């Protein structure tokens, strides 16, 4: 459908997670939840854990 094709990436410029003042710990947990079970999907498969759905 045409609403979903617009929702698709358009490359929004990053603001960078280092320019977001304070809140050090919140960046790590977010990185733990979304970014690292995509890239390192071998170490979840050796261990035998599932990836957090969201």
């Amino acid at each position: 459908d045409s609403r979903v094709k617009a929702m698709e990436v358009d490359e929004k410029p990053t603001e960078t997670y280092s320019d977001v003042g304070g809140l050090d710990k919140q960046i790590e947990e977010l990185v733990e939840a979304i970014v690292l079970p995509m890239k390192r999907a071998d170490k979840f498969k050796d261990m035998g854990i599932r990836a957090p759905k969201g």
Binding site: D1, S2, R3, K5, A6
Partner: protein, 98 residues
């Protein structure tokens, strides 16, 4: 009665020379449609619900055709003639502007 009073008046007689050779042209109608998918050819969805694959016109740039944009297509064998601006939901939003 209204005794036969129809807008136009005194300049519309010179318009009758210009507007009779264009009125017979198929310039109009272009059945207005709307794109649902650009497949890197183009997929339009008519507003009657019946889906067709159409293609480029007389000389339109391939940048004009965008997602969710309306376009006018040839009345008979469907082919994009002239793209048209987007969304026909704006109209309850143009009467709010003072």
């Amino acid at each position: 009665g209204v005794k036969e009073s129809d807008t136009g008046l005194a300049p519309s007689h010179l318009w009758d020379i210009m507007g009779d050779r264009q009125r017979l042209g198929e310039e109009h109608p272009l059945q207005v449609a709307r794109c649902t998918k650009i497949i890197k050819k183009y997929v339009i969805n008519l507003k009657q619900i019946a889906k067709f694959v159409v293609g480029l016109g007389e000389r339109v740039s391939p940048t004009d055709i965008e997602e969710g944009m309306r376009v006018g297509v040839d009345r008979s064998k469907y082919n994009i003639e002239l793209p048209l601006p987007p969304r026909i939901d704006p109209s309850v939003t143009m009467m709010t502007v003072e």
